[PDB]
């Protein structure tokens, strides 16, 4: 023989883990996030754009919309750690956001065989967007320059110190 033997073999049975003590209490959001707040998207595809916050979802995410007529941002969910809660506030009472949940946004995950060598939208999503944004823009038309403010992008100029800036 090349190698002799081990005198004892280790057991192949896998043991069970111990009973954990990590329950899930819900997320306690920061105080500047109330529904109706204008946020600035810090990262993502729509970074630097100002959106309005509607509903706190189940997986600790924030439901936001542009509105899509203003700056082209659709109904979407974002992470609360990737936004800045500005002091600008509009009222979102009169919008029925209880339809949306975590199952409303499903990616329909792709198989490993389908490889995009070189290279669409839900109709339910597009009239849901058209229902909500026409209720938001009626609240936008009350105070002046909000449509222009939401259409314009946010960016840091020379001499802007974010530890001194108030949003």
Partner RNA sequence: GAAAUUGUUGAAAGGGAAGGGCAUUUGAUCAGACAUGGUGUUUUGUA
Partner RNA sequence: GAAUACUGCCAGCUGGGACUGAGGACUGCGACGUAAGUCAAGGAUGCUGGCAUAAUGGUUAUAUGCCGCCCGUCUUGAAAC
Partner RNA sequence: CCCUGAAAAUGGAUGGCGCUCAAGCGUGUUACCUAUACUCUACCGUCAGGGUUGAUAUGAUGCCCUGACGAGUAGGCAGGCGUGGAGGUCAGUGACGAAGCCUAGACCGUAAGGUCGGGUCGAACGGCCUCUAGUGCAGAUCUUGGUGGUAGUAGCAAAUA
Partner RNA sequence: UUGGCGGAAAGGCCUUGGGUGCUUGCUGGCGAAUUGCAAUGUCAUUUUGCGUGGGGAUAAAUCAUUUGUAUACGACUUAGA
Q: Residues interacting with other proteins, by CB under 8 A? A: 1-3, 5, 9-10, 12, 14, 30, 32, 42-43, 45, 47-48, 81-85, 116, 119, 153-158, 161-164, 167
CA dist 150 and 39 (Å) reads: 10
**Residue 85, strand partner residues:** 39
How would you class 140 by CB atoms within 10 Å of its CB: exposed for 0-12, middle for 13-18, buried for 19 or more?
Answer: middle
> Does residue 113 interact with RNA by CB under 7 A?
no
**C-beta closer to other proteins: residue 5 or 23:** 5
Neighbours of 36 (CB within 10 A): 16
Q: Are 146 and 91 spatial neighbours (Cβ–Cβ below 8 Å)?
A: no
What are φ and ψ of residue 111, in 5° steps? -75, 165
Instruction: Select 141 or 161, whichever has its Cβ closest to other proteins.
Output: 161
Binding of RNA at residue 119 (CB under 7 A)? no
Distances (CA, A) of 125 to 8, 56, 100, 161: 63, 19, 10, 39
Question: Interface with RNA by CB under 7 A: which range of 3-11, 32-40, 89-97, 159-167?
Answer: 3-11
Which residue, 6 or 94, has its beta carbon nearer to other proteins?
6
Give contact residues for RNA (rule: CB under 7 A).
Answer: 1-4, 7-9, 11, 15-25, 28, 30, 41, 43-47, 59-61, 68-74, 76-79, 82, 105-109, 112, 120-122, 125-126, 129, 148, 151
């Amino acid at each position: 023989t090349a190698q002799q033997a081990p005198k004892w073999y280790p057991s192949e049975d896998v043991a069970a883990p111990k009973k954990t003590r990590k329950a899930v209490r819900p997320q306690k959001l920061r105080a500047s996030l109330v529904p109706g707040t204008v946020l600035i998207l810090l990262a993502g595809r729509f970074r630097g754009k100002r959106v309005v916050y509607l509903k706190h979802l189940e997986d600790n995410t924030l439901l936001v919309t542009g509105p899509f007529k203003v700056n082209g941002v659709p109904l979407r969910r974002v992470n609360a750690r990737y936004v800045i809660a500005t002091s600008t506030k509009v009222s979102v009472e009169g919008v029925n956001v209880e339809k949306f949940n975590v199952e409303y946004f499903a990616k329909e995950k792709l198989t490993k065989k389908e490889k995009k060598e070189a290279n669409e939208i839900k109709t339910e999503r597009v009239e849901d967007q058209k229902v909500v944004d026409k209720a938001l823009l009626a609240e936008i038309k009350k105070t002046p320059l909000l449509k222009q403010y939401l259409s314009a992008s946010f960016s840091l100029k020379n001499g802007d110190k974010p530890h001194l800036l108030k949003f």
